[PDB]
Design a protein around this ligand. Structure first.
Ligand SMILES: *Cc1c(COP(=O)(O)O)cnc(C)c1O
Ligand SMILES: *Cc1c(COP(=O)(O)O)cnc(C)c1O
Lengths: 382, 382
């Protein structure tokens, strides 16, 4: 018999896609659109990393790499997690993947049996429920509130724990809210995992894009229950290179490497050598991160002041490069709100797919010049 | 609760891994081993491809690409499948993946429900059965015979079809036997798929590593039943670049792109632009394929002559860069034979994991000097 599997037919349809299509006709008819939709840095990847790629090419490093990643990168990763995050991990508890997205995918494929439950905190990054469902798991949503700065209340989370809970996904700094979770909240979540015996999946890819507070890694207190996911994408403007990394309990990391062996074999060899440079040349990487961080902070402050002057509400974000804006004054729901803004000349992402109803995600990984135009046009819509 | 999933615990062990252990300990305790284990070209990737990569780097092509691949590459792929293989496909029935291995992985995830059967022809590439079982499939094995040049008998295959058969996997040229299947057997196989309504998966990565005969793509006789898997890995010495591709029915391709979107997002952008060059610079790309093919043919003939002279039996291969050698004169079984050879100073791959019992896979993707060194050491295990 022919016909698709059930797992692939069970995939839900994005509101983002449909607003994006209308964005493309507008452009076809010559309409100038200001896009605040980016999920990646506007900066190009730093030259020290590009140069490392050039050396790897010239040195013929174009052959297959081990499934868990080249050993030198695994060693550098053990250093980075300890030095930057206070995580006590060995090179064998580290894995290189095809983007942080594959670390998450492999992780779920490795720990979920059909019916296993995963608590996700909304608003959430679009891929989490998807990856959980694709592996036969059940998504259990716990909401975080705008009045609470979108920071989870451990009390609301306790209520979602059942005997089938396998994992809890935490993402700080958060996409799409921009919230940075206080260390006390993270310690509280790590304690629930230990007390109830489940895994804590900590998605820390925005660790370096922080404006205020401190980035705390829950693996500091519960290393045997925590799977730390990270990568080079957001920090070093390496989204198109597809290199992510994770660390955690030895047996789970080994399983994750087995999944890679049967799927992608190993991430691109040239990209692994380029990432090694990003991790070992701390001086040049630090310079890049500080430059981007200052640029982002300026842009964020510029945006928030403008929204506030318009009377528009957004919880102030402390990290990442996103702002969740309430759309109530623009339309009855967020898709209608996004279509209206499109007509005004501004492309934003509807909050539907993230479970951020009545909101729209704005991204400030653009130039100030573009943020000024966008504010001018919101003005018109009001 | 914590713990690994059944799908991940289900994967069984490898005899390859165990002998590579012994081989590593000898490499360790001062031993000189000639390795005939390579599953990749010894040649480095051609300069024009490397030059395309540098250009993309210089141009800032380091951002997220669409899940099915950059549009320029999907189009070039359509030209390649239409021109080289006589396949009639649109760029939309085309997909770029992280190695041909991901194309196969995404394919099985997209078409198999737990219990669905997949027919594989032994000796087979080690990953086929792994990928099928990981998606919940049941592996149904149909043996090809040495006496028959490892070419399948359609009747034996026909005898394996049940109402649960979802696909049949065919790999020509073949890894590990080196057999190239005749157009007529390929047509007979396609016919069964059309006649019994199931998918025909054709792994054609070695198409350009052909010494005698002609490459036939069965997607030509059953376009709506065939998924053609290929990639730049073996043909352009780009194994470490992780770029594969497939074409076939639109609805299946679209489902494979959805699996990518939730796992790897898209393959590395730099590698996609470099592959476009391998595809469109036909003059430089053919010069390389022709240079490699010549070299392989020389090495094959030299290896075959040498074996014959030693009184060792092997079926003469027409494609790829492998030879399956009968180990009867060496040891009771292939693992034992591989261990004796290790002692004699030669590393080979036991046939065990490919279901090639009583055989050992030799690879001639090394220099003639190394092949000569190996033949010399073979004298010691008679
Ligand atoms: C970008 C991102 C990732 C991982 O991205 P990759 O491009 O796959 O490395 C994971 N989680 C969140 C919330 C992200 O924004
Ligand atoms: C090498 C190979 C592939 C695909 O390899 P990738 O490195 O993943 O492109 C597929 N089938 C066979 C038989 C192979 O030998």
């Amino acid at each position: 018999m022919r016909g698709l599997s059930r797992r692939v037919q069970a995939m839900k349809p994005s509101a983002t896609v449909a607003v994006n299509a209308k964005a493309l006709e507008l452009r076809r008819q010559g309409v100038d659109l200001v896009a605040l939709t980016a999920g990646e840095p506007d900066f190009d990847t730093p030259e020290h990393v590009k140069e490392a790629a050039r050396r790897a090419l010239a040195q013929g490093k174009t052959k297959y790499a081990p499934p868990a990643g080249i050993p030198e990168l695994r060693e550098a990763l053990a250093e980075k997690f300890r030095r930057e995050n206070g995580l006590s991990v060995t090179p064998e508890e580290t894995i290189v993947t095809v983007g942080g997205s594959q670390a998450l995918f492999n992780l779920f494929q490795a720990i979920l049996d059909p019916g296993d439950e995963v608590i996700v905190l909304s608003p959430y990054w679009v891929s989490y429920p998807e990856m959980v469902r694709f592996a036969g798991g059940v998504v259990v949503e716990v909401e975080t509130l705008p009045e609470e700065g979108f920071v989870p209340d451990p009390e609301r989370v306790r209520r979602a724990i059942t005997p089938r809970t396998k994992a809890l996904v935490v993402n700080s700094p958060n996409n799409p809210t921009g919230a940075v979770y206080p260390k006390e909240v993270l310690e509280a979540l790590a304690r629930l995992a230990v007390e109830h015996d489940f895994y804590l999946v900590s998605d820390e890819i925005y660790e370096h894009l922080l404006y205020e507070g401190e980035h705390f890694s829950p693996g500091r207190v519960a290393p045997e229950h925590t799977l730390t996911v990270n990568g080079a994408a957001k920090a070093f403007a390496m989204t198109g290179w597809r290199i992510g990394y994770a660390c955690g309990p030895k047996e789970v990391i080994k399983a994750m490497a087995s999944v890679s062996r049967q799927s992608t074999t190993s991430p691109d060899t040239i990209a692994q050598w380029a990432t090694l440079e990003a991790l070992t040349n701390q001086e040049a990487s630090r310079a890049f991160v500080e430059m981007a961080r200052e640029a982002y902070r300026r842009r964020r402050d510029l945006l928030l002041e403008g929204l506030t002057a318009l009377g528009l509400k957004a919880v102030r974000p402390s990290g990442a490069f996103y702002v969740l804006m309430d759309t109530s004054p623009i339309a009855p729901d967020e898709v209608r709100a996004a279509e209206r803004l499109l007509e005004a000349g501004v492309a934003v992402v509807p909050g539907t797919d993230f479970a951020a109803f009545g909101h729209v995600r704005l991204s400030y990984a653009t130039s100030e010049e573009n943020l000024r135009k966008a504010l001018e046009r919101f003005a018109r819509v009001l």
